[PDB]
Each structure stands twice: as C-alpha cells, then as structure tokens.
C-alpha cells in the first residue's frame, strides 16, 4: 500500500536517487496541512452513517425503479448489499484521504468492481450516482463541522472529491 | 501453551482448554489416517460457541473445560 510519502520514495528509487529538494518540500507541505487532513478524515468518520443514509434516501428518491420488484435494490437482501457497498466505498475514500494517495482505493476497492457489477446485473450508472451523492454530503461535512478552527480546506475538499470522482468514473 | 496472540479486545484475550473424545459417527468406515480420540483444543472466549457446537455436533464428548488464561 502507498501513501503520499511512499509514492515519492518509489519514484525517487526508480531514479536511483535520494529524494529531490523538490519532492522534500512537497512532503513538508503535506505535514504542514496534516491537522486539517485529520479533521477532514474525522468529518467523514463522524458522519459515516448519515452520509450513507442521506445518499441512499436521495438515490431512491431519484430512481424509484430500484425499489420496485425487478429492481436491483429489491428485496431486503439486495438493499442491504447496496447499503453495504455504499459503506465500503465511503470507507476506502476516507482511507485514501488519510493517506494522501488513491492507491488503497484503486487496488482494494475499484479494481475489478465494474466487471463484478456487470456480471451481477447491478446498474453501474445508479451506483455511480450513489457515489456522487455521498461526495456532496461528505464534503458538506468536511466544510461545516463542530468547533474546528476557522481556515481554508478547499485543497483537501478537492482532493476528497477526486477520490469520489475516481470511484464514480471507474464504476459507471 | 496455547495459540498465543489473540484479538485485541478484552473478550478475545481469554483462552480456555477443552479435552474431548470424538466418537465414530455412523454410516461409514474411515480408512484414512486416524488419530487417537482424546486430544485437546485451546480456544479463545470469542470463538468458543462455534467450536463446542461443532465438537458436540460430530458425536463428540466434551470431557473437560479449563480456565487456562483467565
């Protein structure tokens, strides 16, 4: 598994080199913003259930076919599987966010996922949408939390978004 | 001793000892490599009911339970 430092190290090694002063300071900056990062990961963990629930309510509000017989979130067994997948993806997105690298998300979650869903008959476009809704709400929470010091988290909100967007793209 | 490192919860930390005597069930001759039917397993507290369930499920006789960790 990689994190943002480990990634630097792998690229340096492929040159046969000690880390460039370029790369050093990029990593010094990651340490600089790490308290914000911890709050951002904490924002997701602290509202995981609601993020999934709210995404869910809204997914089925839009796509009332999934909860009809014939639909891929019917009966209870399938809805529980769908709720479970929402949690799994939100989980690996939070891991990537602590790590500063998408690899755990791509390697443990996204790799093969689309082909799984197609084999199953699970409508990937609906799954992509559920991921887009989780993103909206998750970032909502990253941006408006309990008595965190006031500052600018937009860099981290972007990065979190790209992890949500990776997952969506990979699946649709 | 036992299996050693367990789960990190306190309810995984307690390992117990079971001496059994498995019996030949029914229905079939075992011609493979057989073992003497006494033995003992050390099982952590978190697992224990599946293990005792499959022990008494296969015609076994639980002879002793011992508190070895706790």
């Amino acid at each position: 598994m990689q994190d943002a430092f480990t990634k630097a190290i792998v690229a340096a090694d492929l040159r046969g080199s000690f880390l460039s002063e370029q790369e050093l300071n990029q990593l010094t900056n990651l340490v600089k913003e790490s308290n914000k990062r911890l709050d951002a990961v904490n924002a997701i963990t602290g509202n995981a259930a609601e993020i999934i629930s709210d995404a869910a309510h809204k997914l089925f509000a839009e796509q009332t076919d999934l909860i009809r017989p014939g639909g891929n979130a019917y009966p209870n067994r399938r809805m529980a599987a769908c709720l479970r997948d929402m949690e799994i993806i939100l989980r690996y997105v939070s891991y990537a966010l602590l790590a500063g690298d998408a690899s755990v998300l791509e390697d443990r979650c996204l790799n093969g996922l689309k082909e799984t869903y197609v084999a199953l008959g699970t409508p990937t476009r609906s799954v992509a949408r559920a991921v887009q809704l989780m993103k909206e709400t998750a970032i909502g929470y990253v941006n408006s939390p309990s008595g965190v010091t006031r500052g600018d988290c937009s860099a981290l909100v972007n990065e979190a978004a790209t992890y949500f967007d990776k997952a969506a793209a990979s699946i649709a | 001793m036992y299996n050693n490192v367990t789960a990190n919860t306190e309810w995984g930390r307690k390992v117990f000892k079971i001496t059994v005597a498995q019996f030949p069930d029914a229905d079939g001759l075992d011609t493979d490599n057989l073992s003497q039917s006494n033995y003992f397993v050390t099982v952590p507290l978190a697992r224990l009911l599946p293990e005792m369930q499959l022990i008494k499920n296969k015609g076994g006789k639980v002879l002793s339970v011992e508190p070895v960790v706790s």
Binding site: A49 | V5, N8, T9, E10, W11
Partner: protein, 162 residues
C-alpha cells in the same frame, strides 16, 4: 482493549517482531494527545450529574409520549434505568478519552448492543438523542482539541447506534 499502545503491540507480536520506529512514532501520538483527551475527561467527569439529567429529560421532551402511563418512560424504574444507561455511556466516553482509543466503548457498550436493545425493546433513537443533547452542551464546557476529542467519542457512539 483497543488503545494506540495495544494496537501497535498487537501488530508487532503478530509478526513476531520487536517494536520499531513506526510503532514508537504511533505511541508518541497517543502520549502527545493525552492532555486534550484528559481535559475533556475531567470536564465530562465533574459535569456528569447534570449532563445525564439533561440528556434523560431530552429523551422525554423529544419523545413526549414515552412519559405517559403504559409506556417505557413512565414510573420510577424506567426513568431510573434510563439515567443509569446514559451514565454508562458518559462513563465509557471518559474511559475512551483517558485510554487513548475506543476500546472501552467497543468492549463494554458496542459488542452486543443491538441484540440487547432488540430483546428489551429499547429504541436507539432515544440514545442517539441523549447523545446529540450531550454533544450540544459539551460545546460550552470545552473547546479546541479537548472538544474535538469529546466529539470524536460521542459521534462514535451515535454511529454505533445507527
């Protein structure tokens, strides 16, 4: 019992390995963090009495019907066992604060929660609402990293119940 210390030790042991710089760095986090944690712990400890009575009442104010006869917020024994239960939660929150991890919550409240609540006809909604209220008031007893810690664990209980 899950703490930063027990976790790194567990991970070393399971690879048959001495603690190395990775594991000691981790431990320093837990030790550096103790001050904020333990401030939250002391504030939650001395306000316990009122935090509990505040949350108990709020369960009845949000679920008015509970306090009518034939219901589970009626009579001395239900209302007594309620205060006690919220007190258990606050107690384990302080323990988790002091311990440096969710262990006390995981081992004494989370493991088994739903089975128990389901057999005894206890709705999680009450308990979430008790905790949401406790979270509101702890906003003005603490601030900075002690508040973040208090929040971390209160929210952890709310997610355990959803």
């Amino acid at each position: 019992m899950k703490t930063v210390i027990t976790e790194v030790i567990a991970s070393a042991d399971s690879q048959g390995r001495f603690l190395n710089n990775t594991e000691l760095q981790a431990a320093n986090g837990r030790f550096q963090r103790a001050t904020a944690s333990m401030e939250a712990a002391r504030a939650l400890t001395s306000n316990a009495d009122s935090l509990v009575k505040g949350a108990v009442q709020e369960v009845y104010n949000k679920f008015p019907y509970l306090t009518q006869p034939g219901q589970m917020g009626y009579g001395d024994t239900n209302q007594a066992k309620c205060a006690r239960d919220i007190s258990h939660y606050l107690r384990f929150i302080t323990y988790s604060l002091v311990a440096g991890g969710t262990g006390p919550l995981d081992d004494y409240i989370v493991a088994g929660l739903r089975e128990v609540n389901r057999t005894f006809n206890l709705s999680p909604s009450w308990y979430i609402e008790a905790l949401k209220h406790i979270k509101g008031k702890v906003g003005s007893q603490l601030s900075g990293q002690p508040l973040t810690e208090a929040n971390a664990y209160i929210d952890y209980c709310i997610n355990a119940l959803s």
